[PDB]
Design a protein around this nucleic acid. Structure first.
Lengths: 144, 216, 60, 184, 87
RNA sequence: AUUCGGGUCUUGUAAUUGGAAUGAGUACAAUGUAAAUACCUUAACGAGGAACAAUUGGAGGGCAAGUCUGGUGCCAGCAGCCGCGGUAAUUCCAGCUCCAAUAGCGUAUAUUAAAGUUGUUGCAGUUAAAAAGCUCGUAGUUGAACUUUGGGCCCGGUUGGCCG
RNA sequence: CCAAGGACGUUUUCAUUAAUCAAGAACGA
RNA sequence: ACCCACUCGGCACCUUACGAGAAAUCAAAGUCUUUGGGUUCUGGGGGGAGUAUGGUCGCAAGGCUGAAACUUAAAGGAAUUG
RNA sequence: CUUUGUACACACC
C-alpha cells in the first residue's frame, strides 16, 4: 500500500513522520537549530563592520594561478577574525591599515565563492566610502 | 518528377485520394514523403537544436550532428523527425523528410460549453520517453500554451491555442521530452470518449476500391 | 599553504592602460522617442537582416 | 494610529526575463501604440489577467448561479461600456478570448490618432500631455484614459488653448513681439 | 463530436475494433481489415459486395484474433459449428 | 510604357533649414490653511542643443546583445556555475557599437515558488542514499459478507415546448 | 525414546477470534 | 512401485512482453501522472562520520541510539565505442 | 579478428 499509512484516523503518524523527515533537510535544520545565531561569523546579519588587521596574498585554487589580494579584519560586534576579499582591480590601495570596512557575503550562502579558498566575504565600503565609487573616482577617501 | 513505387503513392499521384484523412481512417502506412507534401502543402518546418555526437575510435573522435525537426500545419497535423548525419544541411534535409513521414492528427476539443471552434485538447493525456513524462491538460480560452519553449513550439505548430503542461523526469534531454510530447499528442486519438460511443458502418479501403489504377 | 605573495603587483593593468577620452556624441532621443527609434530601426528600417535579423555586426 | 491607506501594485513582470519572441512582440506593440516602457504592457496584461481570473472562477460554477449571473452581467456590462468588448460578444467566454491590443486600442492616445487630430501616436502623446485635449469639457493630460464608448463624440481640442482659440500661444506671442520690435 | 449548432467537427472519426470495441489509432500498423465476400445462390462471390471486420493490433498480437474471428463469423451466420460460447 | 525621363503617394537617413507647442523652474494675484508651506488655477518670464545634456547592469553559454579596435600576457584581474587569461583574450583594462530594465537599476542576507529535492494530494529503498537478522508481542493503524428491497396511486414545483 | 510442525483429506468444531507492529521478549554462525 | 489425466501446496527452471524500468533485467521489480487494498521501518548530494559527546547493555572486547564545526561540484548507477 | 574484465579516456607511460 505504498509505504505510508492511508487510514482516515492516522493523521498523528503522518505528522510525526513528517517532522522526523523534515529534520533531514539542510535549510530547515539550519534555521531551527539557530546555527546562524550561534556559529555564523556575522551572527545572522547581512553585513558587518570591522577593523582591518592585515593584508593577505591568497593564492587561487586549481587550475588557476593568481594572487587574490585579500585582507584580514576583525568584527566589531563579536571580535572574531575574518578574511575578506577586496573585489576589484587596484582597490587594495584603498584599504591599507586599521580601516573601518563594511563586509557582505558572496552570494554562496556562506560557502567559498570561486577559486579563492576559505574566504566568504567581500569588502563593500571603506571608511564610509564605497569601493565602487572610489574605483570609478566618484568620491575620494577621507582623512583617517 | 516523382514516379512513386507504392499503390498508395500511385493513387495519390493520380489524384484519387484528395485528403489525408483516408490514410489515418484506414491506417495505411505512409511510405514516401511526396504523398505528405502533395496532400498537405501548408506545413512548415523548424529545427530545434543541433547537437554534436561523438563516436570515439582508435584514431581521433568521429563527429556527426544529430538534428531534430518538428513539422506540421497549424490545424491538425504534426510530425517529428530525428536524424543524425555527417553534414549538417543533410541533417535538416533528412530531418524534414523523416518528420514528414511521421505525420499524426490531433484530437482538438473544448475545455467547456463547446461554443466556437475547438481550442484545446479533448482529454488529459501523457507520454513517456526515457525518464521523461509529459502531461497535457485542457485549459480555458486565452490561457495560452503554458510550456517550455520547445514543446510550446511543438503544440503551437499543432494547432492548440491553450493547454496546461506538467513534466516529470530529466526534461533537459531535448529528444526525450520532444518524443514524450509527441506520444502525448498522439494518444489524444487513442482515448475513447462518449461522443465516440456510436457505431460506424466500417468503410471500405481506397486500396481496394480503386485497385486498377494501382501498381498493376 | 601559499598565503603570502607579491602585493606590489596590484593595479598593474589598470595603471598600464592608456587614457582614451570618451568622444562627444549627439544626444540620443529619450523615453518614448527612444522606443520609437528602436521600433523604426528594427522593423521598417530592416537594413541589417543578413541571415537571421543580425543587428550588431562587425566591420567585414 | 489612524486607519492605514490601502494601496496595490498595478503591473507584473514576466517570469522569463530574456526571450526573443516575447521581447519582439512587446516592442512591436510599444512602437505601434506609442508607449514609453514595457510597464504599460505589463499593467494592461495584469488587468487582463485579473479579468480572465474572474471569468475563469465564474465559469466553474454552473449557469443560473446568482453570483455568476450578477458578477458576469456586471463584468460584460463594464467591458462593453469601455469598448474593449464588442456588443455581440456578450457570452462571458469571449471575455476569455480578449487580447491586450483591444485594451491598447481604447487609450486616449490612439483615440486622438483615430479621430484624425494628430497624424501619429507620438503627436497624440505630445498633444495630450501639453493640455490641448478635452474629453468632455474637461481637460485631461493623461494618455491611458480608457474612453467609455460615448465620450469620443465629445473629444475635441481644449477651449483654453491654441488650436481652440482665446490666445495665440506662448512662442507665437514671442515671435509677434520680435516682429513688432522689428517693425519699430 | 459537435459544437453548439451543426458544423460537424472532429476530422477523422476513427474506426473501432470489431472484437474488443476499442478505437484503432492512426499508426496502429498491426491492425487489419478482413474483407469477406458473400455468395448469392450460385457458389460464386460477387465483386464489390463484402462484409468487413476490423481487428486491432493488441488482440492480433495476443494470438486471440482467430478465436474472435470465429465468434464474429459465427455471429453473422456464415459459420456453423466452430466457435462455442461455452468453453 | 516616348531611350535609365518626370515621377505624383510613400518610409527612413543628413557637420540641412523652418515656424509652432509646452512644462520643469521663478512669480503679481487669488485659492489653500488656525496661520502658513505645497497642490489645483493664473498675469509676466521661462528650449535648440556645448542646452533644460538619464542612469544601472551587461555583450562565450545559461541569458537579449561583438570574432570590432588598442593594452596586459596563467600577471593584473573576470567569473553565482561551467569556465576566460601562458603575446592573434568575442570573457580582463579602456574606446566604439549594441543590448535589457528605466526614474530607476545593481549587491548582500532571509524567505516563497521553481521543489513530485518533505511527496495528504504526490517521492524513493535489487544494482544509484535507504527493507530493521528472524520470530512472538502491548500501545497505534486497519479489518469478510448479511437485516426494506421492489411494485403501484395521487398531488404540487423548476427547466423547457408548439401558442408568441 | 519424547514432544512439536507443514501440506493433503474432511458433508468435524468454534465463531471473526484477524493483518502489521513503538515499548518489551525469545533465538541468533 | 510405475504410466496417463487432473488438482492442491512448495523449491525452482525455460520462452515472450500486453505491462514496468534509466538500463541490466522483472510473472513480479506488473495492475503506479488513466497517480489511493491494509500496514511497519528507512533515506534526502559527497566527506567529516557511524567520529566526538551524552545515555543505555555488556566482565571485557564491544553492541544500540547518535551530531556539529568545517570542506567540496561533483561522488554514484546502467549500458555503448576503443 | 571474436569473446571477456575495467574504477583506464590527456586512454596501462
Amino acid at each position: 500500500g505504498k509505504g505510508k499509512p492511508r487510514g482516515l484516523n492516522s493523521a498523528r503518524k503522518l505528522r510525526v513522520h513528517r517532522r522526523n523527515n523534515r529534520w533531514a533537510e539542510n535549510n530547515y535544520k539550519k534555521r531551527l537549530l539557530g546555527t546562524a545565531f550561534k556559529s555564523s561569523p556575522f551572527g545572522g546579519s547581512s553585513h558587518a563592520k570591522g577593523i582591518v588587521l592585515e593584508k593577505l596574498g591568497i593564492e587561487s585554487k586549481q587550475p588557476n594561478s593568481a594572487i587574490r589580494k585579500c585582507v584580514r579584519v576583525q568584527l566589531i560586534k563579536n571580535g572574531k577574525k575574518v578574511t575578506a576579499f577586496v573585489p576589484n582591480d587596484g582597490c587594495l590601495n584603498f584599504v591599507d591599515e586599521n580601516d573601518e570596512v563594511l563586509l557582505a557575503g558572496f552570494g554562496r550562502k556562506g560557502k567559498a565563492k570561486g577559486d579563492i579558498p576559505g574566504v566568504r566575504f567581500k569588502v563593500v565600503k571603506v571608511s564610509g566610502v564605497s569601493l565602487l565609487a572610489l574605483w570609478k573616482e566618484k568620491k575620494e577617501k577621507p582623512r583617517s | 518528377g516523382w514516379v512513386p513505387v507504392t499503390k498508395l503513392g500511385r493513387l495519390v499521384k493520380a489524384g484519387k485520394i484528395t485528403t489525408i484523412e483516408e490514410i489515418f481512417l484506414h491506417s495505411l502506412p505512409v511510405k514516401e514523403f511526396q504523398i505528405i507534401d502533395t496532400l498537405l502543402p501548408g506545413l512548415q518546418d523548424e529545427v530545434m537544436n543541433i547537437k554534436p555526437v561523438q563516436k570515439q575510435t582508435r584514431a581521433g573522435q568521429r563527429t556527426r550532428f544529430k538534428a531534430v525537426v518538428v513539422v506540421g500545419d497549424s490545424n491538425g497535423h504534426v510530425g517529428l523527425g530525428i536524424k543524425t548525419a555527417k553534414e549538417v544541411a543533410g541533417a535538416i534535409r533528412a530531418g524534414i523528410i523523416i518528420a514528414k513521414l511521421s505525420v499524426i492528427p490531433i484530437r482538438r476539443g473544448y475545455w467547456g460549453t463547446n461554443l466556437g471552434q475547438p481550442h484545446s485538447l479533448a482529454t488529459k493525456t501523457t507520454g513517456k520517453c526515457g525518464s521523461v513524462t509529459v502531461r497535457l491538460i485542457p485549459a480555458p480560452r486565452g490561457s495560452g500554451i503554458v510550456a517550455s519553449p520547445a514543446v510550446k513550439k511543438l503544440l503551437q505548430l499543432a494547432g492548440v491555442e491553450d493547454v496546461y503542461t506538467q513534466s516529470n523526469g530529466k526534461t533537459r534531454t531535448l529528444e526525450n521530452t520532444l518524443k514524450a510530447a509527441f506520444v502525448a499528442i498522439g494518444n489524444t486519438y487513442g482515448f475513447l470518449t462518449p461522443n465516440l460511443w456510436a457505431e460506424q458502418p466500417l468503410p471500405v479501403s481506397p486500396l481496394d476500391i480503386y485497385s486498377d489504377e494501382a501498381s498493376a | 599553504a601559499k598565503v603570502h605573495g607579491s602585493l606590489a603587483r596590484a593595479g598593474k593593468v589598470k595603471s598600464q592602460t592608456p587614457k582614451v577620452e570618451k568622444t562627444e556624441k549627439p544626444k540620443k532621443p529619450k523615453g518614448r522617442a527612444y522606443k520609437r527609434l528602436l521600433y523604426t530601426r528594427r522593423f521598417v528600417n530592416v537594413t541589417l537582416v543578413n541571415g537571421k535579423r543580425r543587428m550588431n555586426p562587425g566591420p567585414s | 494610529p489612524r486607519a492605514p491607506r490601502t494601496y496595490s501594485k498595478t503591473y507584473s513582470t514576466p517570469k522569463r526575463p530574456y526571450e526573443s519572441s516575447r521581447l519582439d512582440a512587446e516592442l512591436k506593440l510599444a512602437g505601434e501604440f506609442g508607449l514609453k516602457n514595457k510597464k504599460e504592457i505589463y499593467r494592461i496584461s495584469f488587468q487582463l489577467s485579473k479579468i480572465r481570473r474572474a471569468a475563469r472562477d465564474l465559469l466553474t460554477r454552473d449557469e443560473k448561479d446568482p453570483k455568476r449571473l450578477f458578477e458576469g452581467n456586471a463584468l460584460i456590462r463594464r467591458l462593453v461600456r469601455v469598448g474593449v468588448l464588442s456588443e455581440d460578444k456578450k457570452k462571458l467566454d469571449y471575455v476569455l478570448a480578449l487580447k491586450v491590443e483591444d485594451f491598447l486600442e481604447r487609450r486616449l492616445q490612439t483615440q486622438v490618432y483615430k479621430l484624425g487630430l494628430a497624424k501619429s501616436v507620438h503627436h497624440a502623446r505630445v498633444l495630450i500631455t501639453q493640455r490641448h485635449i478635452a474629453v468632455g469639457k474637461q481637460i485631461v493630460n493623461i494618455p491611458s484614459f480608457m474612453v467609455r464608448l460615448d465620450s469620443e463624440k465629445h473629444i475635441d481640442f481644449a477651449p483654453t488653448s491654441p488650436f481652440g482659440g482665446a490666445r495665440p500661444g506662448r512662442v507665437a506671442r514671442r515671435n509677434a513681439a520680435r516682429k513688432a520690435e522689428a517693425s519699430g | 463530436m459537435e459544437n453548439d449548432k451543426g458544423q460537424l467537427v472532429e476530422l477523422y472519426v476513427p474506426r473501432k475494433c470489431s472484437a474488443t470495441n476499442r478505437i484503432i489509432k492512426a499508426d496502429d500498423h498491426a491492425s487489419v481489415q478482413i474483407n469477406v465476400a458473400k455468395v448469392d445462390e450460385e457458389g460464386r462471390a460477387i465483386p464489390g459486395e463484402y462484409v468487413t471486420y476490423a481487428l486491432s493490433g493488441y488482440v492480433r498480437s495476443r494470438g486471440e484474433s482467430d478465436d474472435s474471428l470465429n465468434r464474429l463469423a459465427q455471429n453473422d451466420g456464415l459459420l456453423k459449428n466452430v466457435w462455442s460460447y461455452s468453453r
